[PDB]
C-alpha cells in the first residue's frame, strides 16, 4: 500500500526532560513515541497558530478521564500540569468536545482531508537506553472529524523521554498472517534488498 | 441450440446455448444500533427554564437525533418548521444541532417566527431571515406559575435599539428615554430593563407561561456530527441478497465463518482485491460473503 | 419593519406592459422562507391574487393571469417587480406589494399564515 | 376557483353591538386557513385573524376568529369607532388563493 | 393592427449607448416572414436605415454603422430593441420602428415589399 | 451604397395639378423594388406606393406608380390639400437599403 | 482639458454610505496611464488621501480607511466614484477627484507625477 509511514533505520529526535517542551512541526503527521514509569506525561495541544487566533485542538490524558476540547483557548508560554492547572486561560468558541521504564507507548497522529486519526498500543518492554528493536502493530484507538488544519504540536508534562519522528510518503509491504495482525513490514524504497 | 449453432440439424453435439444468472431479491440494508441518543429530553424538560433576556443556549453533537419523538407527540401547543419539513427530518443530517430554550407568555409565541415585529421578537430573542429550525411551544400553567403571581421570569421591555439575530444582552443598568442621565438610579425617564411576567392561574390563555424550545440547525464547512437514526430491520442468509453495509454494496449469498477476526477492523479483503467477509456492524458474528450463483447454460 | 415601498407608472396608456417595483427594506429577498406576492384591488371588487415568488426567484401565478403575467426580482437593488403584460382597462387596480411565511408542520402542509405585511399600494389607471 | 360568501355584505350596528360575518366557502377547508383581512378606508389592509382564530400582533382580543371546514365565522365586541372598516377572508389552504367581495360595518 | 410603440431615452448624455424598445402588439416576434427593422431620421435629411433582424434573432445591420450598432429581441417581452454604442449628436435622430415581410417568388428573390407599418417614432437628441 | 436623387426637391403646384417625382437610382433595379413613401409633416412615413405600381391598401388610385430600371417616376392626378406632405423613394432590392433625400409639395 | 465634475449630496445624514461621482470629460477611464484617486480636505485640516483606482478598475485605498471605502467606476457612463460605508461627522469634508500619470523610469519607479488635475469640489457635511 502506499500511505504515509515512517522510514525505516531513520533518524528521530528525542528529547529528555528531568524540562524540554519545545514546538514542532505538523506538516504531515508526526510519530510520537514515549517511555513512561509514573504517568509523567499528561497530553498533547494541536494547533494551527496556537494564540487564540483560530481552533486548536486539546486532548488531556488526565488520572480521572480522557477529555478532549477543541475550542480557541489563551494559550500560555509554559503549559503544563501540576501534581494546579495552567493549560488554557479562557473559551472563546466551541465546536467539538469528547470525553472518555517498563511501559512503551507508541503514537501516530495523522491529519488528511478534515479527519483526525489516532493509533494507539501499548507494549511492555525491558530496555531503557534506547528504542527497542522489535516489531509492533498499531491499531487505531478512536477517529475525530473536526476538520481544521493543524500546522504544529506541542506536548505537555506534569509536574509534581518521549522520541519524535516524522511520517513520509512512502511504499509498504505488509505481512499478514492468518489471525489479520501485521508480523512484519518491508520499506521498499530503504535497500536494494529489501526492493 | 439451433439458433445458437444457426443450423436446423446437430448431432451428439455439447454446446452452451446461453448464461444464467440469479437475480437477487428482498434488498435489506443494516447499520449499527442507534446508541448514544442526543439530550432533547433535557432541554425540553428542565425543572427550570430561563427567562428569555437570557435564553438557555445547548448544543447538541456527536450523537443521533430521534427527532421523530418531538414531532410523533401530538402534546406541543405549536409545531412550527421553518425550511426543513420535520417529515424525513432524520435523512437531512447536520453537522451543528443548537437548541434555545426560554419562557415567554402565549400572545407572543407568534413572535419567535422569523422577520417578526415584536417586544419580544426584538429587543429580546432575535431568529435570522434565514433560519433553517424549528419553533416548538406548549402551555404549563401548572408548572410555572404560583399564588401571589409569578416575578420569576423576566422580560428586557425597553433596549435603545434592537439587536441583532442570536444575540442575548443581559443590561440591567437603568434605561435611557431622553437626553440627560440619572447614573443607575430608577425615576421619571429612567426605568429597571427588566419587567415582571406576573404569570397566575386565573390569568387569560395569552398571559400564561409557554415554555418555547427552539431548534436550529446548522451546516457548515465541518463534517456531520449530527446524523439521524437508521433501519437495521431484518438481516437473511443463504440466498442471493443484494446488501449495503456501510456503504459498500454488493450482490451476494451471506453465510457464517469460522476463522478468528481482528475487532477493530469492519470489511474484508480477497487476495483478488475483492470483498470476501463483511462484519455486522450492530452484531458481533461475521458474515461471509459468497458471488451469486452463475454460469453457462 | 419589513416595509414594502410600490413604485409605479400613475397612469399608462394602453397595450403597454405594467412594471410596478417594490422597495423592500431590511429582508434579504432570497430567504427561502419568506414568499412575497403581488394582489390588487379593481374599484368596488374584492382582492385578486396574482402571484407569488417561490424561494431562490422561482415564480408561480395565478393560472387565470398566467399567460400575461411574469414576475422578476433584483436583489442586488433589494427590490422585487411585476410586469403585466396586453394591460387593459379592467385590468388595471390599486396594486399591493406583500409578504408571505412558509412553515412546515408535522402535518406536512409547507403552506402557512400569509399577506402579513402589506405595501402603502399605488392606484394605477390604464386609459388612452 | 374556490369562491367566498360573506353575508351580509354591508351591516348598520350601534358601537358596542356584537357581529358575526359568515365567510362560507363553496369547497369546505379542513386547514381552517381561511384568514380575516381588516382594510381600512383608503389604505392598504392588514392581517386582521390568521389560522380561524388569532389576535394577529396587536389586533384587539375583541375581535375573535371561529368556525371550521365548510363556513367561518368572525365575532366582534364592544364595537368601536375605530372598527368601522370592510372584512375580508382568505384560503391559502388551496392555490389559487381567492378572497371574499367585503364587509362594510357603517354607524 | 401590428402597432409598434417606440421606447426610449428623450435625452442621452454622450458616450452613453442608446436603447430603444418597439412594443410590438399582436406579431409574434419569432414568425420567420417578418423581418422588423430600425429606421432614423436626421432633421432635413433623407431617412437612413439602421438594420433588420433575420428570423430567428439573428441580426444584420447596416455596413456604416454595423461596428456600433447591436439589435437584440425580448420574445417574452413580445418587444425588440436597438443598442447604439459610442453615439454622437450627428448619430441621434427621430428613430423609427418598422415591419417587413419577405415572400420567396418563382424568379427567387427572397427580398419583398417592406416598411408597411412604422412606429410612431421618438425624437432623441444627444448633447453635454 | 445606392443613392437615388429626386428632382425637382421642392414643387408649388395649385390643387387639381398633376405632379411628377424623377427618382433615378444611379445603379439600375431590375427588380422595380423601388418603393414610394408619403411622410406627413410631424408625422411617421407611410407605405404609399410598392411594387413600382401599387395602391398601398388604401391610397387613393389618384397616386400612381411608373418606370423600371435606372429611372422611375411618381404621377398625381385631381391633387387634393390632404396630399401636401414629403414624398420619398426606397430601394429594398440591394443591401444597404437607401432612401432618397425627399420632395415637398406645396401650395 | 481633462475636466472633472463632482456630483454628490450636499448634506448626508449619518449612518449613511456617502456616494460621489467624477463626470470626466475627455479620457477613456481605462487608459493604463492615468491612475485617478480621491482627496478630501477636513476645514483647518491638511488634505487627506483616500484612494486611488488602478488600471481595468482594480482599486487601491488608504489603509487608514480601507475596512470602511470602496471606489467603483463607470467606463459606459465615462465617470468613476466614491462609495464610504459608516460616515462620521468627522469623517466628512471638502472632497476632490483627482487625476494621476504613472510612468517608468530607467530607476525603475511605475510611480511618478501625481494630482496634476483637480475636480471644482463639493463640501459635504454629515450631521443629524
Ligand atoms: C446491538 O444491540 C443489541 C441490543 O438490542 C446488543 O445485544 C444483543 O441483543 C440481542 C437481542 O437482544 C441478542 O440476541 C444478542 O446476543 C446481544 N448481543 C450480545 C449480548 O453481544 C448487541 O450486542 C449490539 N451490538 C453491538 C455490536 O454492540
Known amino acids: 500500500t502506499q500511505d504515509l509511514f515512517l522510514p525505516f533505520f531513520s533518524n528521530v529526535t528525542w528529547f529528555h526532560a528531568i524540562f524540554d517542551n519545545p514546538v514542532l512541526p505538523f506538516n504531515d503527521g508526526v510519530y510520537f513515541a514515549s517511555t513512561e514509569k509514573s504517568n509523567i506525561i499528561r497530553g498533547w495541544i494541536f494547533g494551527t497558530t496556537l494564540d487564540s487566533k483560530t481552533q486548536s485542538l486539546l486532548i488531556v490524558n488526565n488520572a480521572t478521564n480522557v477529555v478532549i476540547k477543541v475550542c480557541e483557548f489563551q494559550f500560555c508560554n509554559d503549559p503544563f500540569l501540576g501534581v494546579e492547572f495552567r493549560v488554557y486561560s479562557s473559551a472563546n468558541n466551541c465546536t467539538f468536545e469528547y470525553v472518555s521504564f517498563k511501559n512503551l507507548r507508541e503514537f501516530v497522529f495523522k491529519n488528511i482531508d478534515g479527519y483526525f486519526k489516532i493509533y494507539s498500543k501499548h507494549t511492555p518492554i525491558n530496555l531503557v537506553r534506547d528504542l527497542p528493536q522489535g516489531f509492533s502493530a498499531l491499531e487505531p484507538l478512536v477517529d475525530l472529524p473536526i476538520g481544521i488544519n493543524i500546522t504544529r504540536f506541542q506536548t505537555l508534562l506534569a509536574l509534581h523521554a518521549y522520541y519524535v519522528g516524522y511520517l513520509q510518503p512512502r511504499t509498504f509491504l505488509l505481512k499478514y498472517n492468518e489471525n489479520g495482525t501485521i508480523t512484519d513490514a518491508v520499506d521498499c524504497a530503504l535497500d536494494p534488498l529489501s526492493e | 441450440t439451433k439458433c445458437t449453432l444457426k443450423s436446423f440439424t446437430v448431432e451428439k453435439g455439447i454446446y452452451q446455448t446461453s448464461n444464467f444468472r440469479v437475480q437477487p431479491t428482498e434488498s435489506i440494508v443494516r447499520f449499527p444500533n442507534i446508541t448514544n441518543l442526543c439530550p432533547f429530553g433535557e432541554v425540553f424538560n428542565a425543572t427550570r427554564f430561563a427567562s428569555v433576556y437570557a435564553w438557555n443556549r445547548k448544543r447538541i453533537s456527536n450523537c443521533v437525533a430521534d427527532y421523530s419523538v418531538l414531532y410523533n407527540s401530538a402534546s406541543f401547543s405549536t409545531f412550527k418548521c421553518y425550511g426543513v419539513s420535520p417529515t424525513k427530518l432524520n435523512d437531512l443530517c447536520f453537522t451543528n444541532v443548537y437548541a434555545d430554550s426560554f419562557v415567554i407568555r402565549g400572545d407572543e409565541v407568534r413572535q419567535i417566527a422569523p422577520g417578526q415585529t415584536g417586544k419580544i421578537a426584538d429587543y429580546n430573542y432575535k431568529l435570522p431571515d434565514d433560519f433553517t429550525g424549528c419553533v416548538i411551544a406548549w402551555n404549563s400553567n401548572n408548572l410555572d406559575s404560583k399564588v401571589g403571581g409569578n416575578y420569576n421570569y423576566l422580560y428586557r421591555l425597553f433596549r435603545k435599539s434592537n439587536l441583532k439575530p442570536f444575540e442575548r444582552d443581559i443590561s440591567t443598568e437603568i434605561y435611557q428615554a431622553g437626553s440627560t442621565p440619572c447614573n443607575g438610579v430608577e425615576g421619571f425617564n429612567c426605568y429597571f430593563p427588566l419587567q415582571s411576567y406576573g404569570f397566575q392561574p386565573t390569568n387569560g390563555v395569552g398571559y400564561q407561561p409557554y415554555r418555547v424550545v427552539v431548534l436550529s440547525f446548522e451546516l457548515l464547512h465541518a463534517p456531520a456530527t449530527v446524523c439521524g437514526p437508521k433501519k437495521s430491520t431484518n438481516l437473511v442468509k443463504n440466498k442471493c441478497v443484494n446488501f449495503n453495509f456501510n456503504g459498500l454494496t454488493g450482490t451476494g449469498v451471506l453465510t457464517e465463518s469460522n476463522k478468528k477476526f481482528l475487532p477493530f477492523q469492519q470489511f474484508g479483503r480477497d487476495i483478488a482485491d475483492t470483498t470476501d467477509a463483511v462484519r455486522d456492524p450492530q452484531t458481533l458474528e461475521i458474515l461471509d460473503i459468497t458471488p451469486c450463483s452463475f454460469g453457462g447454460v | 419593519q419589513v416595509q414594502l415601498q410600490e413604485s409605479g407608472p400613475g397612469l399608462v396608456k394602453p397595450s403597454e406592459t405594467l412594471s410596478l417595483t417594490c422597495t423592500v427594506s431590511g429582508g434579504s429577498v432570497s430567504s427561502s422562507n419568506y414568499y412575497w406576492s403581488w394582489i390588487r384591488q379593481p374599484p368596488g371588487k374584492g382582492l385578486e391574487w396574482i402571484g407569488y415568488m417561490y424561494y431562490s426567484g422561482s415564480t408561480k401565478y395565478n393560472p387565470s393571469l398566467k399567460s400575461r403575467v411574469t414576475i422578476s426580482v433584483d436583489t442586488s437593488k433589494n427590490q422585487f417587480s411585476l410586469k403585466l403584460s396586453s394591460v387593459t382597462a379592467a385590468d388595471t387596480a390599486v396594486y399591493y406589494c406583500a409578504r408571505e411565511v412558509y412553515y412546515y408542520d408535522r402535518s406536512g402542509y409547507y403552506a402557512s399564515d400569509g399577506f402579513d405585511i402589506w405595501g402603502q399600494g399605488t392606484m394605477v389607471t390604464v386609459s388612452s | ?107
Not at chain 4, 3 to 18: F, W
Not at chain 4, 49 to 68: E, K, L, V
Not at chain 4, 79 to 87: C, H, I, K, R
Open chain 4, 1 to 107: 376557483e374556490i369562491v367566498l360568501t360573506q353575508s351580509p355584505g354591508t351591516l348598520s350596528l350601534s358601537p358596542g353591538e356584537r357581529a358575526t360575518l359568515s365567510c362560507r366557502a363553496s369547497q369546505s377547508v379542513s386547514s381552517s386557513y381561511l384568514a380575516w383581512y381588516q382594510q381600512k378606508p383608503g389604505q392598504a389592509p392588514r392581517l386582521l385573524i390568521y389560522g380561524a382564530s388569532s389576535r394577529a400582533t396587536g389586533i384587539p382580543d375583541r375581535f375573535s376568529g371561529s368556525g371550521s371546514g365548510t363556513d367561518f365565522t368572525l365575532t366582534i365586541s364592544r364595537l368601536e369607532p375605530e372598527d368601522f372598516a370592510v372584512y375580508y377572508c382568505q384560503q391559502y389552504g388551496s392555490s389559487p388563493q381567492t378572497f371574499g367581495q367585503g364587509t362594510k360595518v357603517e354607524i
